[PDB]
């Protein structure tokens, strides 16, 4: 399925530390963020996505249209400018964030009743699994 709608609660988070370190997120921030349960709220209508990520101490919200390039300032993360593009490869939603960091982006897909999110930066891969609320 390409339907990623829903409220998704984090089951697992592997190598979030390595991903954040590759983004040059400060030590203090990383130490808090790695411990936190994330909730991902995805509102998907056709090509239009509105995504909200919440935890006790940090938020990150992004809206995008599949197949439409969009400039991003990664406020609250690493504060960089990237040129972002989100497209489908089969039922995998693929984001490339073109800019200073190499191999920066993410891939997201549904398998069973779970959402998988693979965050990449440089030589680091973070793997997250969410289950539907």
Written as one string, the DSSP assignment of the chain is -----EEEEEEEEESHHHHHHHTT--HHHHHHHTTPPPEEEEEEETTEEEEEEE-SS-EEEEEEETT--EEEE-TTTT--EEEEEEEEETTEEEEEEESSSTT-EEEEEEETTEEEEEEEETTEEEEEEEEE-
Q: In this structure, what CATH number is given to the domain that contains residue 12? A: 2.40.128.20
Residue 40 pairs in a beta bridge with 8, 53
How far apart, in whole angstroms, are the C-alpha atoms of residue 133 and residue 123? 32
Please give the backbone phi and psi of residue 18, each rounded to the nearest 5 degrees, phi first. -65, -45
Resolution given for this structure, in angstroms: 1.4
How far apart, in whole angstroms, are the C-alpha atoms of residue 69 and residue 64? 9
Query: Where in the sequence is the domain holding 100, given as residue range(s)?
Result: 1-133
Experimental method of this PDB entry: X-ray
Token digits of residue 41: 């709220």
Angle at 17 between CA 69 and CA 122, to 5 degrees: 45
Domain count, the chain: 1
How far apart, in whole angstroms, are the C-alpha atoms of residue 86 and residue 64? 8
């Amino acid at each position: 399925t390409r339907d990623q709608n829903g409220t998704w609660e984090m089951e697992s988070n592997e190598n979030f530390e390595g991903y954040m370190k590759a983004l040059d997120i400060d030590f203090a921030t990383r130490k808090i963020a790695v411990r936190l349960t994330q909730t991902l709220v995805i509102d998907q209508d056709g090509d239009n996505f509105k995504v909200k990520t919440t935890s006790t101490f940090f938020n990150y919200d992004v809206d995008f249209t599949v197949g439409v390039e969009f400039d991003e300032y990664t406020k609250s993360l690493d504060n960089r400018h990237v040129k972002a593009l989100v497209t489908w490869e089969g039922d995998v939603l693929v984001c490339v964030q073109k800019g200073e960091k190499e191999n920066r982006g993410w891939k997201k897909w549904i398998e069973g009743d779970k959402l998988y999110l693979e965050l990449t930066c440089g030589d680091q891969v973070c793997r997250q699994v969410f289950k539907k609320k």
